[PDB]
Amino acid sequence: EHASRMSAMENSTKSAGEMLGKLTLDYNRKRQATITTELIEIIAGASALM
Amino acid sequence: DAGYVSQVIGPVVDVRFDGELPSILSSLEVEGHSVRLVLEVAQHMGDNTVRCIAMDSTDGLVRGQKVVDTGSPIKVPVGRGTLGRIMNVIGEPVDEQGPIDAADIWSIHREAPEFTEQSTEQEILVTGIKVVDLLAPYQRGGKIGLFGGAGVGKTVLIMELINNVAKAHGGFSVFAGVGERTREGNDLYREMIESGVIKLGAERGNSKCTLVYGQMNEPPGARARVALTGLTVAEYFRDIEGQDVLLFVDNIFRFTQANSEVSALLGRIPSAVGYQPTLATDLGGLQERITTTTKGSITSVQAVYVPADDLTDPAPATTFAHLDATTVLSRSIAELGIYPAVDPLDSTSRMLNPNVIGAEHYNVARGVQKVLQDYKNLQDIIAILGMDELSEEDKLTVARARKIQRFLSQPFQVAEVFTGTPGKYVDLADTISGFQGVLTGKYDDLPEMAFYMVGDIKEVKEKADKMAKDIASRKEADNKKVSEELKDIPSLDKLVSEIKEVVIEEDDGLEEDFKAEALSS
Amino acid sequence: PIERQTVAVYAATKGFLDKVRVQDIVAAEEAVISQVNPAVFKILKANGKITPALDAHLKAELRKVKLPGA
Amino acid sequence: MRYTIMVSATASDAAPLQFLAPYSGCAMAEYFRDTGKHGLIIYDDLSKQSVAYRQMSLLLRRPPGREAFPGDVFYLHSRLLERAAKLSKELGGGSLTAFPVIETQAGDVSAYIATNVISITDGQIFLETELFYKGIRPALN
Ligand SMILES: Nc1ncnc2c1ncn2[C@@H]1O[C@H](COP(=O)(O)OP(=O)(O)O)[C@@H](O)[C@H]1O
């Protein structure tokens, strides 16, 4: 039992590393997108006054 | 001699003055308007034109309407003659009790006191709320912030701080309602007639509170200046009458939101996430006046709304550097049923130094926070696995923290209609004695829900002894009570026949009402 | 109506609707609103409270009811 | 206080006065560096200086960049912080040690002023709030 939990908890750290890698790619895409979004909001408010 | 309206765009009015423009921050009056419309000069636009924010609605303003300079800023009545009254942003009474008697009328704009007349004295303000006076204790004379998103309990906590601190103390109180619901401003008004804080009629001089109200329906020019109006009433009580004041401000967030609503119409290119470029210095000009000086003392309690439970947002994040005690309320504490939903870790006070509150209050507070922090580092592994590998050192600190978590909950005397419980005032010594019991294992045998919504540790023992009476009192009513009674559970149409059948009118009859409203007036 | 809501919430919070399959609680209370007395709703609507002369009188009338499966 | 100067541009002061206070505190501290002695300058909330400088720049209608900050907000803090040096022996050998203080929000060191000052400075003393409630005080990550 201990030697199949060891092979089960190895297969779930991979699955929690593959999921963490897809989330970090998804987070960096959202991080880049909210910096572009807040900046377009700032330039639009500035171009409406200038 | 006077100016005229040149431009009306929303709440922002441009007034053109032929000769001798009014000063910035000065008050202007539009005559000919349907109501009293007060403008306040925000800037000089540069062609003999000032740009103003309106303290009321600009519906019905006309370009060319005569504007009278008053020669000073907005002046409101201050003194004992405002105790027991509700004021406007511009000092008008909105409680329909006549004109406001005024010792003096004061400009709502002044500078911060000085660096030389600051007070370096720390003494604890005991509130009765045991999560407050244990972990983040308030200072008598300092600025207190109540943070939290929508619906976590900022207004109930600020209501419980009114009747636990202001109901019996030496000086006066000022409630500044800044841009919140009108319904709860009426709830606060009627609660203070019944509590005797506000007395009406000829007993009005024995009042201990002044309400200044600028609630959500008011335009952004109004809600941006109510906090200055209520602070001016508190600054008269501190500077002139030299006495201790309590100043409660519900949502100081709405002061920053109101300035942000007019800001782009004042010609300012916007700052980060949507606020005005002058966000930190508009807020800083307000909070620097709410201080204990060498003349008197203003104990401020400010609710701060955090938008979408985000303490990262610039309007809550700027407020954090202005306070001496930041009670942070959390949704996750509220969703479990612990009320007041105070985050016990995120709440920080400056009275939590050992050379201020002593060592037997500091070590209990740092001990309670250590057990609650450890439990949150184990709750990552309990919610996955389920606390059968947790060492019985870690199992004991889960049971100790879960008792500590419920023992920070307390029934409030003002939440007696949400929770069906009479409220509990807990003294400071009984809070220190109780949590030192739960920390050192003096009460490890008591159940977990015996700590929930009680006063002190003597009422945990009066509740654990109660629940262990009343769970073994379950089986008296199982084998009987279905039948064979003294017939005060009587027959069917016996209970149907005392029903006083109310007459239904079976048509609305409003067109007879609508013609009747025509003949009246 | 509000009187048939509180009777159905009474039938679930006073333990009269366990021993009932969780798939047909939707059909269980359709019996419970229809098989209890149509006069017990009128008393609860007129009083607005479930009185002590009624909370036993309804929970003993929530036993003379036929539920699916049971 | 017999060794300390305090330059205080508080919250009610004008945003030009909070922008210039780290620079005027540095010039007071550069006296000891330039005359062979040693200095310790602490810019407590250098992130509050940049907010005061962003206020002046948006009001002067200078074109805003990320989080509405100016273009020269890196040049703001680098020109200040590069004045903390150890001087050579032919200039007295004096020194100035800077401790800028940057407040993050939710521990985000990818924020725009935080990445600027991390670039300028040599090290960082990261204080994490999760270690602060574990009893580890000073809560140094
Ligand atoms: N101490 C408390 N005890 C019981 N219920 C509470 C307490 N604090 C808040 N609540 C519940 O939370 C709801 C919202 O609280 P409220 O005072 O409106 O907070 P906010 O002003 O932040 O929205 C209240 O109507 C009440 O039901």
Ligand SMILES: [Mg+2]
């Ligand atoms: Mg509220």
